[PDB]
A paper describes a structure:
ClfB, an MSCRAMM (Microbial Surface Components Recognizing Adhesive Matrix Molecules) family surface protein, described as a fibrinogen-binding clumping factor, is a key determinant of S. aureus nasal colonization, but the molecular basis for ClfB-ligand recognition remains unknown. In this study, we solved the crystal structures of apo-ClfB and its complexes with fibrinogen α (Fg α) and cytokeratin 10 (CK10) peptides.
The apo-ClfB(197–534) structure was solved at 2.5 Å resolution, consisting of residues Ser197-Ala534. No electron density was observed for the C-terminal eight residues in the apo-ClfB structure. The polypeptide chain of apo-ClfB(197–534) is composed of two distinct domains N2 and N3, as previously described for other MSCRAMMs in S. aureus. In the crystal structure, both N2 and N3 have two layers of β-sheets that pack tightly against each other. In contrast, packing between the two domains is much looser, resulting in the formation of a large groove between them where presumably ligands bind. In the crystal structure of apo-ClfB, the N-terminus (Ser197-Ala201) of one ClfB(197–542) molecule binds to the N3 domain of a symmetry-related ClfB molecule, forming a β-sheet together with the strand G mediated by 2 pairs of main-chain hydrogen bonds. Additional hydrogen bonds involving ClfBGln235 and ClfBVal200 further contribute to the N-terminus-mediated interaction between ClfBs. Structural comparison of the apo-ClfB and the two complexes shows that the RMSDs of the Cα atoms in ClfB are 0.46 Å and 0.49 Å respectively, indicating that the overall ClfB remains unchanged upon binding of the ligands.
Author numbering: 201 to 534
Write the structure that this text describes.
């Protein structure tokens, strides 16, 4: 019924003891995740002695990073296929997979390895922030491990500040980030975080539009509707505790869900756009969007917008918009 386990894979025997990594290098130590910024890690590796088909070795990510970034594999067993290690002749030497939960790569050997000895090679992998564990702009410990060898590192995330808007006390202010996109399962879903009035200004007759396209509706795979979209809305207690990474957890104590108070305040009157009547609001809110994209293949392009006037004077009308873009593209399914 219950047995002890040490890993998340099926195969022969782990051979970290036979694999030594070397010349470990990050393409860079600083980038803006909020601008589709990322890095790659790359290393040489060698097998001392012999291994066989089904033996494997591993690499582990720290809290600061993910192997998958904004690509979601919930609908694929939280498992993200990786490109294979191939030989000059073209033959696959190892099959690669990344467990999202465990932030662990696994490389399994193919029958290639049987009749050979003292394999050497190198590989690179993309690396992205962990929006959840690296929520704020700053410098994190990024010590990566390979074949049981720790390669100490440090990454700096300069997240474009999600606190953006019209520079005036009455100013319209808003922003968003799509931090989650399922491109494998075929369900075509995404997660977008929207920060409303992150200046925590007092704004009247405030309207917010979440568009599933930007300029030209034809140019986006975005599908915003009653049927395609689910919205959750939270008042923010202390806007100071909002993440630069747009990661927001519904169960956060800093959030107070209010989506209920919005029952008849959300409209889909317009094609591919969700209109939200906030009205007079004097604080910051988070909208968690769970959305869908179409099979067109077009980039998922989005745009969030907020407008308002002075609640006391009804003058000083202000409008502010924020754009979002992601690649949903995939190859062949059947
Ligand atoms: Mg080793
Ligand atoms: Mg999909
Ligand atoms: Mg209003
Ligand atoms: Mg509509
Ligand atoms: Mg205004």
């Amino acid at each position: 019924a219950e047995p002890v386990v040490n890993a998340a894979d099926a195969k022969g025997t782990n051979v970290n003891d036979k694999v030594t990594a070397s010349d470990f290098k990050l393409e860079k130590t600083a980038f803006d995740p909020n601008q589709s910024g990322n890095t790659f890690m790359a290393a040489n590796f060698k097998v001392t002695g012999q291994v066989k088909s089904g033996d494997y070795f591993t690499a582990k990510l720290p809290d600061s990073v993910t192997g998958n970034g904004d690509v979601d594999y919930s609908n694929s067993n939280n498992t993200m296929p990786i490109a294979d290690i191939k030989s000059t002749n073209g033959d696959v030497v190892a099959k690669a997979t990344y467990d999202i939960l465990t932030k662990t790569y696994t490389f399994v050997f193919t029958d290639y390895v049987n009749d050979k000895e003292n394999i050497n090679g190198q590989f690179s992998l993309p690396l992205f922030t962990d929006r959840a564990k690296a929520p704020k702009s700053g410098t994190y410990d990024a010590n990566i491990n390979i074949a049981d060898e720790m390669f100490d590192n440090k990454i700096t995330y300069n997240y474009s500040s999600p606190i953006a808007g019209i520079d005036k006390p009455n100013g319209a202010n808003i922003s968003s980030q799509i931090i989650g996109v399922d491109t494998a399962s075929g369900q075509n879903t995404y997660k977008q975080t929207v920060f409303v009035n992150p200046k925590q200004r007092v704004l009247g007759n405030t309207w917010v539009y979440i568009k599933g396209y930007q300029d030209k509706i034809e140019e986006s795979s975005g599908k915003v509707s009653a049927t395609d979209t689910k919205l959750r809305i939270f008042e923010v207690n202390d806007t100071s505790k909002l993440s630069d990474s747009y990661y927001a957890d519904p169960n956060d104590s800093n959030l107070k869900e209010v989506t209920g108070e919005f029952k008849d305040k959300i409209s889909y009157k317009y094609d591919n756009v969700a209109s939200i009547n906030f009205g007079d609001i004097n604080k910051t809110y988070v909208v968690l969007v769970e959305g869908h994209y179409d099979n067109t293949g077009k980039n998922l392009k989005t745009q969030v917008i907020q407008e308002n006037i002075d609640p006391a004077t009804g003058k000083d009308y202000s409008i502010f918009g924020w754009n979002n873009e992601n690649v949903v593209r995939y190859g062949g399914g059947s």
